[PDB]
Design a protein around this ligand. Structure first.
Ligand SMILES: CCCCCCCCCCCCCCCCCC(=O)OC[C@H](COP(=O)([O-])OCC[N+](C)(C)C)OC(=O)CCCCCCCCCCCCCCCCC
Ligand SMILES: CCCCCCCCCCCCCCCCCC(=O)OC[C@H](COP(=O)([O-])OCC[N+](C)(C)C)OC(=O)CCCCCCCCCCCCCCCCC
Ligand SMILES: CCCCCCCCCCCCCCCCCC(=O)OC[C@H](COP(=O)([O-])OCC[N+](C)(C)C)OC(=O)CCCCCCCCCCCCCCCCC
Ligand SMILES: CCCCCCCCCCCCCCCCCC(=O)OC[C@H](COP(=O)(O)OCCN)OC(=O)CCCCCCCCCCCCCCCCC
Ligand SMILES: CCCCCCCCCCCCCCCCCC(=O)OC[C@H](COP(=O)(O)OCCN)OC(=O)CCCCCCCCCCCCCCCCC
Ligand SMILES: CCCCCCCCCCCCCCCCCC(=O)OC[C@H](COP(=O)(O)OCCN)OC(=O)CCCCCCCCCCCCCCCCC
Ligand SMILES: CCCCCCCCCCCCCCCCCC(=O)OC[C@H](COP(=O)(O)OCCN)OC(=O)CCCCCCCCCCCCCCCCC
Ligand SMILES: CCCCCCCCCCCCCCCCCC(=O)OC[C@H](COP(=O)(O)OCCN)OC(=O)CCCCCCCCCCCCCCCCC
Ligand SMILES: CCCCCCCCCCC1=C(C)C(=O)C(OC)=C(OC)C1=O
Ligand code: SF4
Lengths: 70, 98, 156, 47, 104, 318, 105, 80, 169
């Protein structure tokens, strides 16, 4: 009956689920297990480039805490 | 001065000499006029963003709005000419020689 | 050998795709239009076979000639047939499209549409029932299923 | 002053109005030929 | 950069789909088929010009979600309501002088 | 690694467009008291595949074109714009996180009428060009209310950023403060994609869709799949815009499941509108825009300008 | 026919977009704010004739701030001489001009 | 005026809702008690840097530390 | 190469202007102006004019060139030496200018021009939590009061003027 449309809706739903889940997992893989840094404003980019310069490995997502100071 | 300003001014002069040398169509003339406007838009925008001159960021928008209303006026003139003569040819606009 | 196997499976693929996605153009000329419209009605439902109802005539696969072809609409019939992209098939529905029918001896009726277009399936009736037309559509699908376009291409 | 170049020039009309110097015909048919399919209509459209 | 990579990828996939959809049905050799100004409407041009002028008025309206953040809010609200009112007055003059007729 | 993310955007777009044809034919089947396809696959699941393979080996129709270049560029532009409308969509994370994703989508959708215009130029028939100009005038008409409704809603968002629009709707769906904007938005996006009851090209009220007319047209599958990419995209954009879901930043899959279910319901609502109403006449949807939607859209635009000021609810820029 | 209605009525119709050194939204400075302020405060009140020949240094500094012609010409000279010395092999680039020194902050 | 209003609400209710929503949008911010707070919140949002003052000796209202009592306060915004 | 991205987009911009300004047909001239508007938008976007570039796409290409192609479709008919000759003329003039300003890092047609990449002239600071371009455009409503008045009056008058001159009476 009407539940015969549910396989097509389910396949289309999996096909819509793949892009968002994909970009979330790729953003967590490319950024040290965390969210991708959002730099809409030039202050955010400034702090992000400062992180890239203080991390020592040319990667903004390598966070340096109090273990880096004396 | 900067290298991109040469190309944007040369784009203005290319669309100028296109606009100053008609072939047949009045529509191509209006296309050259709005290409002149486009090059003026880009040139003003590159100056104002380069200078960090904050208040003139609204200047290219006012340029775009006024010259697109001007373009609408020109298209309506072309439409009245085309409803008179059947085409948009500039050689049909020769009644005022006498 | 290997190439015969490959062109056989590719024939199977393209024949499956072409028979399972038939898009009909219907010349609903006369009473057989009513019975094709019943073949698209919810009981028989051509659309569950992949056979969409009210397909575009520009991109249709089968021309269902459903009604009396007169002498005055024979060139329009041939013009719509000539505007069809290949592979095009023609199902002749009903007695007047098959052989003139009840108007066989008329001064104004083409005695069967096969004087005008090549016909693949002849569906008999006045009208044939919507079930009989769906039988003819499935026989057309079986006719497409045993086509050998790439096998004959390979053996030439 | 008449010349060879300005020889064909006539003066403009007195009211400065020049003479002007049609409507579409459509051969129409029903979109999907399921219901009717056998209709021919020669329209005269004015837009 | 990633935007340019994405635009190039979308353009490439689109061009690949178009090239396939034109050249893949040319594989099967088919039977070579051998058998065998537009009228102007003023209303069609007028709806396009009315679009263009209201689109310029929209181009004026687009910096409003940034304009609400100002410290001159009374002037800002006055000019915002004034631009939307002039768009409405352009629509009213387009209405009452038979401009929106037969494409209403 | 980024190209993997681009491809896992754009290939499931094409697969979802493929199975939207199945979902359309099934749901329109059961609403019409019949079934949709169930023979070609189990429950019809091979119908998009069979239909695509059929369309890709079908002959180019009969005729030749007036302009080869625009006949090529109109499906290229249609598919390119239909794929680039998805890259700022925050689901929960956009592929291209930009500050102006709303204005990007509005501009790229404004560019989509050139495919219709160039396919009207590229056909040889002077009647197909008239039908294309009617379609262009329809789409540019409803882009006006798209722009103004979108601006009025973004006055509660604070920016053109699409990802901020998840943060804006954390306490309530944005359909609650803006349901008249939401319903005129939904009907205007319906009239954007040439979707019934606004589909005048694919139906009657048309001077050229009239059975045994001329006009060499493009390969139908490309414009068709561009159109269904636009349908799913505008429903996802309406879902983000008015029915924004819960987002846990540690579990993005909850937001992805929730916006996916809402976008499926909204696309089925498109399917359920096209199987419920007759078509507008052309001047009737011009009436519906210019005399009905645009006055309410300007009035609600004045309302949504002046309303955060009088309620002290001006959203932040950042 | 410069009918100075703005100075007559005291209204400010367009003096705000006129120069870069004016009041800006959120006090954003122009990149040549000081040079333009120096040229304007030099040339104020003395007229165009005295301003072209008595405020020439401030206007030259401001034009060279805007266009940066002397700066780009100087960098062209340095870069061309650097590339000539690299091609002749008589110069090596330092590690801090090659990306090998773990930048400051 | 009551016959005309019911007549235009029977014949053209879209335009009546249009003019009603527009008229409320015009006359309502001058009547609302929270329109003051919009200005107060926009002028309290610190985009720039609070560039400090040289302590000449007589500035009793200016604090010396951010946590000092004197200076502009946002307790009205925390509470509302 | 990649530091010269704004320059390469400006070369594509001038090539597109030589394309449509040589005037093959208003259809192809419209197409050339569309491609030129897109690449000049990319030039604006690569300085940080994101809103102004989206104004190019949304307003210029989105409304106005759509109306140009629309009106062309109502005034031309669907189905040379001078166009292709003037095309290659402008292309050779542009590439000779490119070659001079690249081999010399200097040229003077009307003004003196640098030959390096235009990355050199940028600022080295930030704008904080705003775009300076966005805030300057947002000040149209608080500082551009007279500018809004004359722009809205010109657009209302423009609607009136188009309804007058297309009326025919
Ligand atoms: C990825 C999205 C879906 C894409 C489409 C689905 C994938 C399959 C693509 C290939 C389909 C099969 C080949 C094309 C169709 C051939 C049909 C046909 O009639 O062929 C006859 C034609 C011609 O056969 P013919 O010589 O008998 O010609 C008949 C016509 N007369 C006699 C009038 C001239 O066959 C071919 O041209 C062979 C094409 C190559 C065969 C397959 C090779 C591998 C392809 C991969
Ligand atoms: C038609 C008139 C509509 C505008 C009515 C006044 C709107 C307003 O708030 O103006 C104050 C605004 C701004 O005043 P303000 O009080 O915001 O000024 C403070 C200074 N700034 C801008 C730096 C924050 O405009 C003016 O005072 C002068 C410009 C408009 C002058 C009148 C134009 C009349 C046109 C008739 C034709
Ligand atoms: C986002 C998820 C979905 C959102 C909801 C949408 C789902 C439902 C869809 C249903 C199917 C629709 C298919 C297409 C229909 C198109 C036809 C149509 O509806 O035309 C619209 C019709 C058109 O009118 P008409 O043609 O029916 O009526 C005749 C019109 N005249 C008189 C001009 C000839 O109505 C509208 O335009 C209404 C638009 C939205 C109205 C919003 C109302 C706001 C009310 C505010 C308060 C008012 C009270 C007074 C003021 C008080 C102030 C305090
Ligand atoms: C020195 C002054 C001119 C500098 C630019 C020269 C470009 C080369 C063209 C030379 C003149 C060619 C010519 O005859 O142009 C006339 C032509 C219109 O004539 P048409 O109707 O096409 O044909 C009938 C023939 N009279 O008109 C056209 O084709 C106009 C095309 C103009 C486009 C200019 C493109 C850039 C040119 C270089 C940069 C300036
Ligand atoms: C070297 C070896 C390889 C050589 C080249 C071949 C490559 C692989 C091509 C696909 C497989 C080849 C065979 C295709 C089917 C042949 C068998 C067949 O037709 O079986 C019939 C059966 C249904 O029976 P039917 O006759 O329809 O009966 C009516 C219902 N009682 O039909 C069914 O049960 C369903 C048939 C489904 C067909 C396969 C699935 C579709 C094709 C998928 C791959 C191609 C498309 C990829 C995606 C394109 C874009 C969407
Ligand atoms: C993100 C999710 C996307 C999902 C996309 C796909 C959705 C639908 C999923 C598949 C549903 C079931 C399909 C079953 C098809 C029919 C299979 C079959 O057995 O067909 C019979 C046919 C002939 O077999 P025969 O040897 O004649 O048998 C006689 C028995 N005495 O045998 C044949 O024709 C040969 C075998 C053909 C098998 C075809 C199977 C389907 C292929 C579809 C292409 C895509 C595959 C998935 C890709 C994405 C996921 C990895
Ligand atoms: C018929 C011809 C072929 C037709 C098919 C193909 C063309 C049509 C479809 C493609 C349209 C391309 C549109 C791309 C630009 C869109 C605007 C844009 O860049 O917005 C994104 C973003 C703005 O957001 P924001 O966060 O403020 O900026 C980043 C700073 N944090 O800004 C950024 O992220 C800036 C990124 C750098 C700048 C990107 C420039 C792109 C390349 C130049 C334009 C290319 C298109 C030219 C042709 C257009 C159509 C004719
Ligand atoms: C003051 C605040 C700011 C106001 C300005 C902002 C307005 C925002 C809305 C924008 C509207 C744009 C279009 C306006 C066009 C007005 C003219 C008009 O439509 O007149 C024609 C109409 C009869 O319609 P007809 O021509 O027949 O349409 C074809 C179908 N029959 O005629 C009518 O139906 C009569 C129209 C006039 C009477 C309407 C009365 C509405 C009253 C609502 C409550 C009061 C609201 C406050 C405003 C004062 C209203 C008097
Ligand atoms: C890449 C995948 C391609 C799938 C192509 C499916 C095309 C749609 C099939 C049915 C159909 C529908 C729903 C349809 O709406 C339509 O327009 C009226 C058709 O054309 C006549 C159709 O044939
Ligand atoms: S075969 Fe008979 S019933 Fe059928 S259309 Fe002809 S006359 Fe009518």
């Amino acid at each position: 009956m009407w539940f015969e449309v549910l396989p097509g809706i389910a396949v289309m739903g999996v096909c819509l689920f793949i892009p968002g889940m994909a970009t979330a997992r790729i953003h967590r893989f490319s950024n040290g297990g965390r969210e991708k840094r959002v730099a809409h404003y030039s202050y955010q980019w400034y702090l992000m480039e400062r992180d890239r310069r203080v991390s020592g490995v040319n990667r903004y997502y390598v966070s340096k805490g109090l273990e880096n100071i004396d | 001065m900067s290298l991109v300003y040469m190309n944007i001014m040369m784009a203005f002069t290319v669309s100028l000499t296109g606009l100053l040398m008609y072939r047949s169509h009045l529509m191509s003339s209006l296309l050259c006029l709005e290409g002149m406007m486009l090059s003026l838009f880009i040139l003003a925008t590159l100056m104002i963003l380069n200078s960090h001159f904050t208040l003139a960021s609204m200047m290219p928008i006012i340029l775009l709005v006024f010259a697109a209303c001007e373009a609408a006026l020109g298209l309506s003139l072309l439409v009245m000419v085309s409803n008179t003569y059947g085409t948009d040819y500039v050689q049909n606009l020769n009644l005022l020689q006498c | 050998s290997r190439g015969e196997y490959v062109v056989a499976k590719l024939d199977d693929l393209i024949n499956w795709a072409r028979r399972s996605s038939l898009w009909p153009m219907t010349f609903g000329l006369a009473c057989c239009a009513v019975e094709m419209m019943h073949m698209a009605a919810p009981r028989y439902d051509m659309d569950r076979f992949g056979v969409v109802f009210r397909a575009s005539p520009r991109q249709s696969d089968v021309m269902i000639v459903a009604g009396t072809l007169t002498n005055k609409m024979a060139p329009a019939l041939r013009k719509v047939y000539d505007q069809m992209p290949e592979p095009r098939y023609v199902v002749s529905m009903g007695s007047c499209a098959n052989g003139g029918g009840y108007y066989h001896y008329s001064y104004s009726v083409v005695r069967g549409c096969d004087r005008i277009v090549p016909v693949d399936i002849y569906v008999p009736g006045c009208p044939p029932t919507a079930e009989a037309l769906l039988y003819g559509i499935l026989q057309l699908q079986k006719k497409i299923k045993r086509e050998k376009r790439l096998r004959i291409w390979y053996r030439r | 002053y008449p010349t060879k170049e300005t020889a064909h020039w006539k003066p403009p009309p007195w009211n400065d109005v020049d003479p002007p110097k049609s409507n579409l015909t459509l051969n129409f048919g029903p979109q999907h030929p399921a219901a009717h399919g056998v209709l021919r209509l020669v329209m005269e459209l004015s837009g | 950069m990633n935007l340019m990579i994405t635009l190039l990828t979308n353009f490439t996939l689109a061009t690949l789909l178009v090239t396939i959809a034109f050249w893949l049905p040319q594989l099967n050799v088919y039977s070579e088929k051998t058998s065998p100004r537009l009228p102007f409407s003023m209303k069609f041009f007028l709806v396009a010009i009315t679009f263009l002028l209201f689109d310029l008025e929209i181009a004026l309206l687009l910096p409003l979600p940034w304009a609400s953040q100002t410290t001159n809010l009374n002037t800002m609200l006055t000019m915002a309501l004034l631009l939307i009112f002039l768009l409405a007055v352009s629509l009213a003059y387009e209405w009452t002088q038979k401009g929106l007729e037969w494409t209403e | 690694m980024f190209m993997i993310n681009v491809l896992t955007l754009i290939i499931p777009i094409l697969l979802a467009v493929a199975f939207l044809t199945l979902v359309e034919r099934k749901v329109l089947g059961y609403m019409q008291f019949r079934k949709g396809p169930n023979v070609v696959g189990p429950y019809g699941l091979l119908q998009p595949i069979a239909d695509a393979i059929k369309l890709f080996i079908k002959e180019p129709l009969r005729p030749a074109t007036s302009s080869i270049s625009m006949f090529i560029l109109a499906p290229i532009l249609a598919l390119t714009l239909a794929l680039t409308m998805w890259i700022p969509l925050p689901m929960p994370y956009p592929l291209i996180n930009m500050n102006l994703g709303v204005l990007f989508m509005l501009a790229m959708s404004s560019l989509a009428v050139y495919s219709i215009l160039w396919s009207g130029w590229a056909s040889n028939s002077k009647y197909a060009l008239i039908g294309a100009l009617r379609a262009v005038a329809q789409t540019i008409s409803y882009e006006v209310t798209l722009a103004i409704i979108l601006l009025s809603v973004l006055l509660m968002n604070g920016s053109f950023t699409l990802s901020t629009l998840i943060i804006t709707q954390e306490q309530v769906w944005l359909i609650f403060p803006a349901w008249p904007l939401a319903m005129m938005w939904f009907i205007s996006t319906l009239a954007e994609t040439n979707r019934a009851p606004f589909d005048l090209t694919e139906g009657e009220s048309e001077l050229v869709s009239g059975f045994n007319v001329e006009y060499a047209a493009g390969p139908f599958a490309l414009f068709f799949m561009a159109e269904y990419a636009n349908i799913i995209m505008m429903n996802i954009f309406t879902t983000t815009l008015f029915l924004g879901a819960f987002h846990n930043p540690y579990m993005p899959e909850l937001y992805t499941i929730n916006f996916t279910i809402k976008s499926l319901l909204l696309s089925i609502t498109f399917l359920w509108i096209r199987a419920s109403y007759p078509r507008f006449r052309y001047d009737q949807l011009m009436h519906l825009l210019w005399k009905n939607f645009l006055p309410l859209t300007l009035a609600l635009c004045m309302w949504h300008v002046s309303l955060p000021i009088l309620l002290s609810s001006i959203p932040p820029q950042t | 026919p410069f009918f100075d209605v703005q100075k007559k009525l005291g209204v400010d119709l367009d003096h705000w977009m006129t120069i870069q050194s004016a009041e800006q939204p959120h006090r954003i400075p122009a990149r040549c704010h000081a040079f333009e302020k120096e040229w304007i405060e030099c040339a104020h009140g003395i007229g165009s004739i005295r301003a072209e020949k008595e405020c020439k240094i401030e206007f030259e500094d401001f034009r060279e701030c805007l266009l940066r012609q002397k700066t780009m010409k100087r960098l062209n000279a340095i870069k061309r001489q650097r590339d000539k010395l690299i091609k002749e092999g008589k110069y090596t680039p330092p590690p801090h001009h090659s990306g090998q020194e773990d930048l400051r902050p | 005026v009551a016959a005309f209003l019911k007549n235009v609400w029977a014949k053209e209710p879209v335009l009546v809702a249009s003019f009603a929503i527009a008229g409320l949008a015009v006359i309502l911010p001058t009547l609302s008690p929270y329109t003051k707070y919009s200005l107060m919140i926009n002028r309290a949002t610190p985009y720039n840097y609070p560039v400090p003052l040289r302590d000449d000796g007589n500035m009793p209202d200016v604090p010396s530390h951010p946590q000092d009592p004197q200076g502009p306060s946002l307790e009205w915004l925390k509470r509302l | 190469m990649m530091t010269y991205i704004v320059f390469i987009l400006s070369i594509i911009f001038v090539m597109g202007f030589v394309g449509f300004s040589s005037k093959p047909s208003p259809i192809y001239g419209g197409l050339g102006l569309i491609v030129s508007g897109g690449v000049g938008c990319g030039i604006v976007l690569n300085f940080g004019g994101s809103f102004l570039g989206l104004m190019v796409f949304l307003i210029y290409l989105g409304g106005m060139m759509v109306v140009f192609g629309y009106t062309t479709a109502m005034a031309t008919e669907q189905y040379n030496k001078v166009v292709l000759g003037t095309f290659i003329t402008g292309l050779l003039m542009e590439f000779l200018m490119v070659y001079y300003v690249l081999k010399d890092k200097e040229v003077e047609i009307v003004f003196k021009f640098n030959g390096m990449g235009d990355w050199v002239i940028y600022d080295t600071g930030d704008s904080g939590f705003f775009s300076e371009e966005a805030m300057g455009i947002a000040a149209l409503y608080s500082y551009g009061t007279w500018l809004v008045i004359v722009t809205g009056w010109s657009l209302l008058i423009g609607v009136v003027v188009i309804m007058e001159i297309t009326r025919g009476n």
